[PDB]
Amino acid sequence: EVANPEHYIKHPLQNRWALWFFKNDKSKTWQANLRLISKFDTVEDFWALYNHIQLSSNLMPGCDYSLFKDGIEPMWEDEKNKRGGRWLITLNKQQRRSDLDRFWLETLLCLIGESFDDYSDDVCGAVVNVRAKGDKIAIWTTECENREAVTHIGRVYKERLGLPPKIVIGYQSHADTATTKNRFVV
Ligand SMILES: C[n+]1cn([C@@H]2O[C@H](COP(=O)(O)OP(=O)(O)OP(=O)(O)O)[C@@H](O)[C@H]2O)c2nc(N)[nH]c(=O)c21
């Protein structure tokens, strides 16, 4: 007879995820300022990471945190992002204190907990931008043309964050990045 796995195995996550950190430095290419922190694929390992790193609200302006499925780099150029887009959450200066941190954690939980159910395969990850003019959080998806998946993900995400329902958020395609209107709204 063998031991009861319930008493000792870590609680597995559907996907293995990777957390990245971005430190702004004008003298270097965007990609050069983007570096991996570490990866994890269990509930225990997620908290071990989250608990020892600074809350988004404490980072220096210009820095980002990005949680993307293992194998998908948090950039437009990636095979899994080039044809996709993002649901953007735009926060005001007051929300840095009131909602940024709780919104980001809920975002992390939505990702690792596969809260988008049937459309989990369309989800790539999420990014939080700490900025002086106003912080930003966003869920990135793989194909801007998958209306069904994209709209359902947006609705679910918006409901999970729990902000006033009357507030509309938009979805923008990465390819449409101005050298930017929304494709969908919920
Ligand atoms: C997500 N992303 C951001 N950048 C670079 O980062 C710059 C800033 O893009 P940003 O997404 O970090 O928002 P920010 O608020 O800092 O600035 P703004 O929206 O223009 O006011 C871009 O114009 C790019 O030069 C990126 N550059 C490359 N090559 N690939 C990416 O995926 C990528």
From Swiss-Prot:
Protein name: Eukaryotic translation initiation factor 4E
Function recorded in the entry: Acts in the cytoplasm to initiate and regulate protein synthesis and is required in the nucleus for export of a subset of mRNAs from the nucleus to the cytoplasm which promotes processes such as RNA capping, processing and splicing. Component of the protein complex eIF4F, which is involved in the recognition of the mRNA cap, ATP-dependent unwinding of 5'-terminal secondary structure and recruitment of mRNA to the ribosome.
Outcome reported for the amino acid change (mutating K93A): Higher affinity for EIF4G1
One CC-aspect GO term: perinuclear region of cytoplasm
Family per similarity comment: Belongs to the eukaryotic initiation factor 4E family.
Outcome of mutating W76L: Decrease in mRNA cap binding
Species of the source: Homo sapiens
Location(s) in or outside the cell: Cytoplasm, P-body; Cytoplasm; Cytoplasm, Stress granule; Nucleus
